[PDB]
DNA sequence: GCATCCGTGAGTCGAGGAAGCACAATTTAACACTTTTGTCAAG
DNA sequence: CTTGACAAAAGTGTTAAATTGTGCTATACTGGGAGCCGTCACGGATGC
């Protein structure tokens, strides 16, 4: 069968014993000399199976013939050794031990069921306070003892063994109270010591005995080794023994008849007891417990009158009943187990339902939590008493191996040590119980057993972590194995090490195609080793596979035909290149390997930006897909030439880069001269003749008669591009000169470089007209123009022609950057003549400010602010001067060309190289008053360098502490939206979102058109929900909005015809466990409608998390994004109006108050004094509209306006941060993540359902329950929308596997085990953990069952069937 | 590690990239056939050296270790089928 | 509460220390109770162990988990005895109670003894509990007639129990007590020689100093045995992202190459055996274990085919020679021999 | 703090002997350290 | 409504590997002797 | 195809030597030692 669901539930002791093949009774692991496992040990062959396949311990059966047989001599079953990895054991605990996962995991589930606090549960479990299970008529301090009452050690001893005290008398003094007399509290016993409790007083050690002979008060002295054997006031006849001693020589006897009197006791024992004299034999014995009315002695004549412990004193021959109660009080996990057994879940559920109606909110919340736990136990079918372990399971020994390394040393895991400690403590407890150890020792050993069980289950959670003696390293328990970044889930389940994988340093390959990479010969031989062996076997290179492998083992034994065979193997196959970190989905790309001589991987330049890979020492990994499915997926979906557009924004990602852009811009830029630059003539011949006279330059802009042209456009008229480029080759004209060409029947006035670029595009796309329509010939080719050209080529031609154009552009750009002559010199950083003047003006203004400050016209703070403003203005002016100097005097300056073309550098860096470094910041954040007036070309001073080092180190630390946060946020986004897949073509929903085209600017307080980039990010590749009529164009419902449609909508908005665009979005998608094709829109990586089965959730998470590193960190930047995704309450939260109305300001010196007034309601908000109010008197504010500048609390906005408003606010605020950094990200991803955030609701009115008020569930589930209740006429469940962060939403998912593998593994696992949650394997993480086919991509049910058949076989089937 | 002649770590982020591409079969191979499916990897190697296609992969050993450790934590982890009947992924080797 | 040792010390601090007189009376009561149990067993004829267990269960009360019904029956039988025997029953009960009190009141002594044995592979509380076991044994064997205080006799048993527990439970791989003593003596001798010579001694000097019957080889083997196993989870590196288990290959399960070559060898052998006759191939498979069973002897195969041993040997040799001829003429099976 | 010596070149060992680490036993930790310890204080002039 | 203790989390690769002593109960190396073949002559 | 003689290979039955495990030391000892520390933010109960 096929695994479809995974169920986790509590394991009963009977089930645990059923799992085990035998009880592990000894802690011995292996023998030290023979190295064989010891019998009944942690590694016993009799329990966990044989060490080697088909071989018993006794060495009698050694073959597969006796398969499934258990040897009679040794007991080891004759089977495969691999069962050693799968056969478990069990340890039968002498006393029950509570599972720590159900004790210290707040809220304590056992405590929740028993209504016991964490402290009380810890005290009871770890033997600190007793708990009563049967009072047995016990009265404490005048209050009868009730059940479930906690008793300390003193209280338990008082109730169980009675009250007793010992007062030690000083030597020599005689007690004032006779032996066997009742005394009251405060009564003096001896002259130096007084009693503290009422009871019978007894002599402990009489030091002197005073016998009164009758014929003589003879006295005898008693020593510690002598014991009196007669009572006080007893008649002793001559010869009777009086005092017994070790030596009969010193034994004291009576000479004649007398009366024995005891005197001088060592101490007095006062016990709260009743004394009964007796004459005949007693019916009871010492240690028993009696009740009033019970017979004690004399055959019923003497009857007990009070509960207590009975003890017979033969010396005084009386029966003492100490007043005590046979109270049943216990500690440890046995009492907890008994209490959980006694619970009736039905009665508890009924009581909790009754209590749920209490008006108190805290009472209702507590009842809801307890009732949720009870309902989980009831529905799961588990028993509460299963939470306390009676038999501890034992992991198979191969999962905790004791291996022998090649060096002879033994390596073992910490689980062996934990099991050894547990077994030792259990056996010691068994021995102590068998030996009748006292209560203290037994209690201590039971506490040790409980602590050992806790350490085995989860080490370090409670108390000091258990460490191996001789070191302070905590032992690795099962919880530590299964939790954390180094746990099983994140290290061996979600990610694994793979075979057929290599790694090497990458180098740039310009000669490679976009779909090719340079795989080294040795790496290809090692990675394709099995295929190479098969190919060598096919040919005559080797006789068989073994000979081929032996040949390949030695480097000098490899012939020359092996390389030819390897080349034959890799024909058609592709390999996956990977570079860590894989920030987005293009970090792994399929390339067609090309064998190269060397050891470094050759990487195509164009994909480098996709890989975020430079060639300063990067390393990349190579993986080899094996089967036909993997090869088809790599060649069709994962191919580098097939992923030309970025899925995040839809713009091209494999586009011309630094050197390519530099070369194309250099050739496509025209020359501007200044020789003539204005001279006007009458006829063109005059201008030409002046040109040969040298008065005017070739490219100098002149006027011939009325029009403005140049000498080049008149002197050089080329009939076709071939003649122009032939003249360029001969050196008559340059690529940067402006001449007249006849292209496509049009007399253009352009440069031969631009005509050459047009020809390049035409030859690359093999279509002159389309290529002409794609390019813009009137501007130099910068990065943006090349990107637009690539996108237009992708739209008009397809992937293959776009890849060909990309390769041609790369080749030509590289060649022209090589031959153009771009170089960086110290004089290329031109110092403007205006910098000195600006610095002098700044110095004069600073001197004026200082003089004014000395005059007292301004204070320190505003003087510092003015200095900062002055220096910022000076820096901006210097930047403008630098760029004006470049664009006027040196238009082809390498720094200017690189900055303008976008190949490298930004205006700030060009300023630092050419202008001034500027202001710098202190480590505390303040900026230095004096700036760094010297640039890098002039050279900084030591002090200026030290000042700049502060900012440099701050930026480095910011990047270091920001990369981890960005990665963790990306992990959260992946784990919360891992289940989102395109699962159907259309869900049929009628809801939508109105994307606004106008933003309400507050400085003008009016609607202004948003930026084109924002509208494109919010509308490109989206399905129109409603038909839109703009500019005579009717976009029907269900039409995908392309870039042309977005531009048309933008133009219509500019014409004032449309205010907002209604589009279908994932927020309004009704598809369960995913989205629909018509709601997602285009697949931005292909500029076509999304294919059904794509994992859009993972794509969205990666797209959002990739530019997290680029966001500035320094409520702004990446922390703002994090607090937005987590729905955290901002510290400087804004104040919003809960209800709509007219605003009224009551600003007073005492307090600041804002009133929202309505027809019958009036709300008051007490604002802080330093609040930047953005609303004035006489304004109409709506519900949720902010009143103070700041960050809106998402929960307050959701509760004030509604789910749509809070979703829109979240999307807009998240997108604002990316806009501020220049990163273009489509709103689909943010909307998907927000939809995942808004997936949960809270029940307010249970209605006709079993749900509880305040319970949090999924919106889809409650909607289904509501429609089901409506179908058969029942009161619907009232629910309130709930917003939670990505962490809380991911942790509360229905599938326990993904939640456990994400975070809080212990809590998720314990909740799932208690509730018996069954994982349906809906998302992608669970299938990854189980290694199944994920329900996305080729594994989606929509396309998984597609069948391909030829014509002939299909016709045969039809003919043979019909 | 190169010194120990080990493979390349295919961590979580690479799995996310494969899921984003939708390469379900490649991801399954890299999780089972090429990593820890003992019978699966042995059969795949035998098929490749024989010129045949690799067989369908099976349950990884890592999931078996997960199940056994969860059982050692006294948690009953059971894998079910469409009809909710228990499914033995250990091929009867752990059944008494 | 958080510190188990603190809680245990607080618990043992609630039992006042025994004076000399109290110690003597408790020891005398224990001796008298043992003698009374002996007399009761002699008279009633019951097992002394059974009577002692019944008396101990009655003394400890019902707060303890043989079924209690037989304990009650035995107690009723003992109480049915006349007064001269109920006297011994009461003496036994008082002796058991005194034994419990005496054991309870000497926990400070065992704590003080065990505080000097810490750091030898066992935790403090484990040493305390093993010393408690030794203390119980000492109370069982203590005699007050010799007039020696209880501490003097109890210390021997407590330290003996602690040392035995350290020898038997401080190592993951258990080593017998005699070998533990040998290792300890070897370590002491090595340390003494090391401090005497001012350098680490070689095995020859250690063996010479140990005594007769010891050589360098035996010292080396003893040191090799005394090597504690190394943990598989010891981190290596500044970051806590590596462990020993990540560098130890698994050499038990066959590698994919090994399984592949085994399958290839099986297929080639099956193809080669096709050239043999039907009977010869079956005989060779039976004689070489190709039927997954142990190689059947000549007599077993002969009885299976109803043939004598000599003919089976002859046909097996002839078939082996034919296979050798085929291999020589083909050479398609030599590479698998290695 | 006892690190395996880096002696690729004499300058390597010379720098390694003159390194100052805020980590180690009793010191800070890689992921327990904020911006306060990682910044260049004004007193680092001429000393670090 | 708020101060406070507790628990959980904080990027990816790679390259870093301190007694002895006596005495009885259990195991096993060393042999000695039948038992069982593996093979060889006899055709 | 069979019918007897040989020459080891393995198993059975003692034999003590080696190894292993439990019992016993009688002046008097009567409550532990190591920590110990530079982080922030966010649930979430725990009380006042
Ligand atoms: C004393 O510290 P070390 O450890 O000795 O440091 P290095 O030896 O100087 O580092 P390196 O790697 O050899 O070279 P480099 O830093 O000049 O860049 C080499 C390239 O690897 C990559 N890369 C570097 N660190 C990385 C990281 N943490 N995660 C992921 N990728 C990383 C980058 O793509 C670098 O561009
Ligand atoms: C238009 C012309 C053929 C005209 C015809 O068919 N008659 C085709 C045929 C072969 C083409 C060149 C090669 O591909 C190599 C190289 C590929 C780069 O991508 C772009 C540059 C190169 C030099 C190409 C330029 C151009 O595209 C050529 C000359
Ligand atoms: Mg780099
Ligand atoms: Mg001309
Ligand atoms: Zn066996
Ligand atoms: Zn939809």
PDB file of N, CA and C in Angstrom, chain A residues 492-544:
ATOM      1  N   UNK A 492      18.714  16.286   8.606  1.00  0.00           N
ATOM      2  CA  UNK A 492      18.667  15.027   7.878  1.00  0.00           C
ATOM      3  C   UNK A 492      17.337  14.746   7.197  1.00  0.00           C
ATOM      4  N   UNK A 493      16.293  15.531   7.459  1.00  0.00           N
ATOM      5  CA  UNK A 493      14.990  15.328   6.840  1.00  0.00           C
ATOM      6  C   UNK A 493      14.681  16.391   5.793  1.00  0.00           C
ATOM      7  N   UNK A 494      14.718  17.669   6.172  1.00  0.00           N
ATOM      8  CA  UNK A 494      14.487  18.735   5.206  1.00  0.00           C
ATOM      9  C   UNK A 494      15.684  18.949   4.292  1.00  0.00           C
ATOM     10  N   UNK A 495      16.888  18.673   4.769  1.00  0.00           N
ATOM     11  CA  UNK A 495      18.075  18.777   3.942  1.00  0.00           C
ATOM     12  C   UNK A 495      18.970  17.577   4.156  1.00  0.00           C
ATOM     13  N   UNK A 496      19.531  17.086   3.054  1.00  0.00           N
ATOM     14  CA  UNK A 496      20.354  15.887   3.088  1.00  0.00           C
ATOM     15  C   UNK A 496      21.578  16.095   2.212  1.00  0.00           C
ATOM     16  N   UNK A 497      22.600  15.282   2.457  1.00  0.00           N
ATOM     17  CA  UNK A 497      23.749  15.204   1.569  1.00  0.00           C
ATOM     18  C   UNK A 497      23.461  14.184   0.476  1.00  0.00           C
ATOM     19  N   UNK A 498      23.860  14.509  -0.749  1.00  0.00           N
ATOM     20  CA  UNK A 498      23.447  13.739  -1.915  1.00  0.00           C
ATOM     21  C   UNK A 498      24.664  13.135  -2.599  1.00  0.00           C
ATOM     22  N   UNK A 499      24.445  11.987  -3.235  1.00  0.00           N
ATOM     23  CA  UNK A 499      25.446  11.372  -4.089  1.00  0.00           C
ATOM     24  C   UNK A 499      25.488  12.080  -5.440  1.00  0.00           C
ATOM     25  N   UNK A 500      26.473  11.699  -6.255  1.00  0.00           N
ATOM     26  CA  UNK A 500      26.655  12.268  -7.591  1.00  0.00           C
ATOM     27  C   UNK A 500      26.728  13.791  -7.533  1.00  0.00           C
ATOM     28  N   UNK A 501      27.434  14.302  -6.527  1.00  0.00           N
ATOM     29  CA  UNK A 501      27.555  15.733  -6.302  1.00  0.00           C
ATOM     30  C   UNK A 501      29.018  16.111  -6.131  1.00  0.00           C
ATOM     31  N   UNK A 502      29.409  17.213  -6.770  1.00  0.00           N
ATOM     32  CA  UNK A 502      30.754  17.738  -6.656  1.00  0.00           C
ATOM     33  C   UNK A 502      30.732  19.228  -6.362  1.00  0.00           C
ATOM     34  N   UNK A 503      31.931  19.790  -6.219  1.00  0.00           N
ATOM     35  CA  UNK A 503      32.066  21.209  -5.921  1.00  0.00           C
ATOM     36  C   UNK A 503      33.412  21.703  -6.430  1.00  0.00           C
ATOM     37  N   UNK A 504      33.427  22.912  -6.989  1.00  0.00           N
ATOM     38  CA  UNK A 504      34.668  23.475  -7.507  1.00  0.00           C
ATOM     39  C   UNK A 504      34.536  24.985  -7.643  1.00  0.00           C
ATOM     40  N   UNK A 505      35.690  25.640  -7.792  1.00  0.00           N
ATOM     41  CA  UNK A 505      35.731  27.081  -8.003  1.00  0.00           C
ATOM     42  C   UNK A 505      35.279  27.404  -9.424  1.00  0.00           C
ATOM     43  N   UNK A 506      34.547  28.506  -9.571  1.00  0.00           N
ATOM     44  CA  UNK A 506      33.981  28.914 -10.851  1.00  0.00           C
ATOM     45  C   UNK A 506      34.851  29.996 -11.474  1.00  0.00           C
ATOM     46  N   UNK A 507      34.945  29.971 -12.803  1.00  0.00           N
ATOM     47  CA  UNK A 507      35.598  31.011 -13.584  1.00  0.00           C
ATOM     48  C   UNK A 507      34.655  31.414 -14.709  1.00  0.00           C
ATOM     49  N   UNK A 508      34.906  32.589 -15.273  1.00  0.00           N
ATOM     50  CA  UNK A 508      34.020  33.145 -16.290  1.00  0.00           C
ATOM     51  C   UNK A 508      34.325  32.509 -17.641  1.00  0.00           C
ATOM     52  N   UNK A 509      33.283  32.022 -18.308  1.00  0.00           N
ATOM     53  CA  UNK A 509      33.401  31.560 -19.669  1.00  0.00           C
ATOM     54  C   UNK A 509      32.596  32.420 -20.622  1.00  0.00           C
ATOM     55  N   UNK A 510      33.282  33.252 -21.411  1.00  0.00           N
ATOM     56  CA  UNK A 510      32.569  34.087 -22.387  1.00  0.00           C
ATOM     57  C   UNK A 510      32.181  33.353 -23.657  1.00  0.00           C
ATOM     58  N   UNK A 511      32.878  32.274 -24.010  1.00  0.00           N
ATOM     59  CA  UNK A 511      32.582  31.538 -25.232  1.00  0.00           C
ATOM     60  C   UNK A 511      31.414  30.575 -25.078  1.00  0.00           C
ATOM     61  N   UNK A 512      30.973  30.307 -23.852  1.00  0.00           N
ATOM     62  CA  UNK A 512      29.885  29.368 -23.634  1.00  0.00           C
ATOM     63  C   UNK A 512      28.553  29.970 -24.060  1.00  0.00           C
ATOM     64  N   UNK A 513      27.616  29.096 -24.413  1.00  0.00           N
ATOM     65  CA  UNK A 513      26.250  29.516 -24.669  1.00  0.00           C
ATOM     66  C   UNK A 513      25.504  29.697 -23.349  1.00  0.00           C
ATOM     67  N   UNK A 514      24.330  30.324 -23.433  1.00  0.00           N
ATOM     68  CA  UNK A 514      23.550  30.606 -22.232  1.00  0.00           C
ATOM     69  C   UNK A 514      23.113  29.336 -21.514  1.00  0.00           C
ATOM     70  N   UNK A 515      23.037  28.209 -22.221  1.00  0.00           N
ATOM     71  CA  UNK A 515      22.598  26.947 -21.646  1.00  0.00           C
ATOM     72  C   UNK A 515      23.747  25.969 -21.424  1.00  0.00           C
ATOM     73  N   UNK A 516      24.983  26.457 -21.376  1.00  0.00           N
ATOM     74  CA  UNK A 516      26.152  25.602 -21.247  1.00  0.00           C
ATOM     75  C   UNK A 516      27.023  26.052 -20.082  1.00  0.00           C
ATOM     76  N   UNK A 517      27.724  25.088 -19.487  1.00  0.00           N
ATOM     77  CA  UNK A 517      28.710  25.354 -18.452  1.00  0.00           C
ATOM     78  C   UNK A 517      29.916  24.457 -18.681  1.00  0.00           C
ATOM     79  N   UNK A 518      31.076  24.920 -18.228  1.00  0.00           N
ATOM     80  CA  UNK A 518      32.299  24.160 -18.397  1.00  0.00           C
ATOM     81  C   UNK A 518      32.573  23.211 -17.251  1.00  0.00           C
ATOM     82  N   UNK A 519      32.239  21.938 -17.435  1.00  0.00           N
ATOM     83  CA  UNK A 519      32.459  20.933 -16.403  1.00  0.00           C
ATOM     84  C   UNK A 519      33.848  20.332 -16.563  1.00  0.00           C
ATOM     85  N   UNK A 520      34.685  20.339 -15.526  1.00  0.00           N
ATOM     86  CA  UNK A 520      36.020  19.745 -15.652  1.00  0.00           C
ATOM     87  C   UNK A 520      35.945  18.259 -15.966  1.00  0.00           C
ATOM     88  N   UNK A 521      36.957  17.776 -16.693  1.00  0.00           N
ATOM     89  CA  UNK A 521      36.966  16.380 -17.117  1.00  0.00           C
ATOM     90  C   UNK A 521      36.996  15.432 -15.926  1.00  0.00           C
ATOM     91  N   UNK A 522      37.815  15.735 -14.917  1.00  0.00           N
ATOM     92  CA  UNK A 522      37.893  14.866 -13.746  1.00  0.00           C
ATOM     93  C   UNK A 522      36.574  14.846 -12.983  1.00  0.00           C
ATOM     94  N   UNK A 523      35.953  16.016 -12.807  1.00  0.00           N
ATOM     95  CA  UNK A 523      34.664  16.073 -12.130  1.00  0.00           C
ATOM     96  C   UNK A 523      33.600  15.313 -12.908  1.00  0.00           C
ATOM     97  N   UNK A 524      33.592  15.452 -14.235  1.00  0.00           N
ATOM     98  CA  UNK A 524      32.623  14.720 -15.042  1.00  0.00           C
ATOM     99  C   UNK A 524      32.850  13.218 -14.947  1.00  0.00           C
ATOM    100  N   UNK A 525      34.114  12.791 -14.947  1.00  0.00           N
ATOM    101  CA  UNK A 525      34.421  11.371 -14.821  1.00  0.00           C
ATOM    102  C   UNK A 525      33.951  10.823 -13.481  1.00  0.00           C
ATOM    103  N   UNK A 526      34.154  11.583 -12.404  1.00  0.00           N
ATOM    104  CA  UNK A 526      33.769  11.087 -11.087  1.00  0.00           C
ATOM    105  C   UNK A 526      32.256  11.125 -10.893  1.00  0.00           C
ATOM    106  N   UNK A 527      31.592  12.167 -11.403  1.00  0.00           N
ATOM    107  CA  UNK A 527      30.150  12.295 -11.217  1.00  0.00           C
ATOM    108  C   UNK A 527      29.386  11.291 -12.070  1.00  0.00           C
ATOM    109  N   UNK A 528      29.812  11.098 -13.319  1.00  0.00           N
ATOM    110  CA  UNK A 528      29.179  10.160 -14.236  1.00  0.00           C
ATOM    111  C   UNK A 528      29.858   8.797 -14.218  1.00  0.00           C
ATOM    112  N   UNK A 529      30.405   8.400 -13.069  1.00  0.00           N
ATOM    113  CA  UNK A 529      31.155   7.148 -12.998  1.00  0.00           C
ATOM    114  C   UNK A 529      30.333   5.927 -13.389  1.00  0.00           C
ATOM    115  N   UNK A 530      29.111   5.710 -12.880  1.00  0.00           N
ATOM    116  CA  UNK A 530      28.366   4.512 -13.311  1.00  0.00           C
ATOM    117  C   UNK A 530      28.023   4.518 -14.792  1.00  0.00           C
ATOM    118  N   UNK A 531      27.588   5.665 -15.318  1.00  0.00           N
ATOM    119  CA  UNK A 531      27.319   5.765 -16.749  1.00  0.00           C
ATOM    120  C   UNK A 531      28.588   5.535 -17.559  1.00  0.00           C
ATOM    121  N   UNK A 532      29.720   6.055 -17.079  1.00  0.00           N
ATOM    122  CA  UNK A 532      30.984   5.842 -17.775  1.00  0.00           C
ATOM    123  C   UNK A 532      31.372   4.369 -17.776  1.00  0.00           C
ATOM    124  N   UNK A 533      31.156   3.675 -16.655  1.00  0.00           N
ATOM    125  CA  UNK A 533      31.436   2.243 -16.608  1.00  0.00           C
ATOM    126  C   UNK A 533      30.555   1.485 -17.589  1.00  0.00           C
ATOM    127  N   UNK A 534      29.269   1.839 -17.653  1.00  0.00           N
ATOM    128  CA  UNK A 534      28.377   1.187 -18.607  1.00  0.00           C
ATOM    129  C   UNK A 534      28.828   1.436 -20.042  1.00  0.00           C
ATOM    130  N   UNK A 535      29.214   2.674 -20.356  1.00  0.00           N
ATOM    131  CA  UNK A 535      29.662   2.987 -21.710  1.00  0.00           C
ATOM    132  C   UNK A 535      30.945   2.241 -22.055  1.00  0.00           C
ATOM    133  N   UNK A 536      31.884   2.165 -21.109  1.00  0.00           N
ATOM    134  CA  UNK A 536      33.119   1.424 -21.345  1.00  0.00           C
ATOM    135  C   UNK A 536      32.836  -0.058 -21.553  1.00  0.00           C
ATOM    136  N   UNK A 537      31.866  -0.604 -20.817  1.00  0.00           N
ATOM    137  CA  UNK A 537      31.462  -1.987 -21.042  1.00  0.00           C
ATOM    138  C   UNK A 537      30.854  -2.165 -22.427  1.00  0.00           C
ATOM    139  N   UNK A 538      30.076  -1.181 -22.888  1.00  0.00           N
ATOM    140  CA  UNK A 538      29.475  -1.275 -24.216  1.00  0.00           C
ATOM    141  C   UNK A 538      30.538  -1.356 -25.304  1.00  0.00           C
ATOM    142  N   UNK A 539      31.573  -0.530 -25.210  1.00  0.00           N
ATOM    143  CA  UNK A 539      32.670  -0.561 -26.163  1.00  0.00           C
ATOM    144  C   UNK A 539      33.714  -1.577 -25.703  1.00  0.00           C
ATOM    145  N   UNK A 540      34.853  -1.615 -26.384  1.00  0.00           N
ATOM    146  CA  UNK A 540      35.918  -2.544 -26.080  1.00  0.00           C
ATOM    147  C   UNK A 540      36.928  -2.060 -25.066  1.00  0.00           C
ATOM    148  N   UNK A 541      36.664  -0.936 -24.396  1.00  0.00           N
ATOM    149  CA  UNK A 541      37.628  -0.385 -23.448  1.00  0.00           C
ATOM    150  C   UNK A 541      37.855  -1.348 -22.290  1.00  0.00           C
ATOM    151  N   UNK A 542      36.780  -1.910 -21.747  1.00  0.00           N
ATOM    152  CA  UNK A 542      36.875  -2.829 -20.628  1.00  0.00           C
ATOM    153  C   UNK A 542      35.990  -4.041 -20.864  1.00  0.00           C
ATOM    154  N   UNK A 543      36.370  -5.203 -20.323  1.00  0.00           N
ATOM    155  CA  UNK A 543      35.513  -6.388 -20.495  1.00  0.00           C
ATOM    156  C   UNK A 543      34.204  -6.299 -19.731  1.00  0.00           C
ATOM    157  N   UNK A 544      34.227  -5.799 -18.499  1.00  0.00           N
ATOM    158  CA  UNK A 544      33.026  -5.729 -17.676  1.00  0.00           C
ATOM    159  C   UNK A 544      33.092  -4.468 -16.822  1.00  0.00           C
TER     160      UNK A 544
END
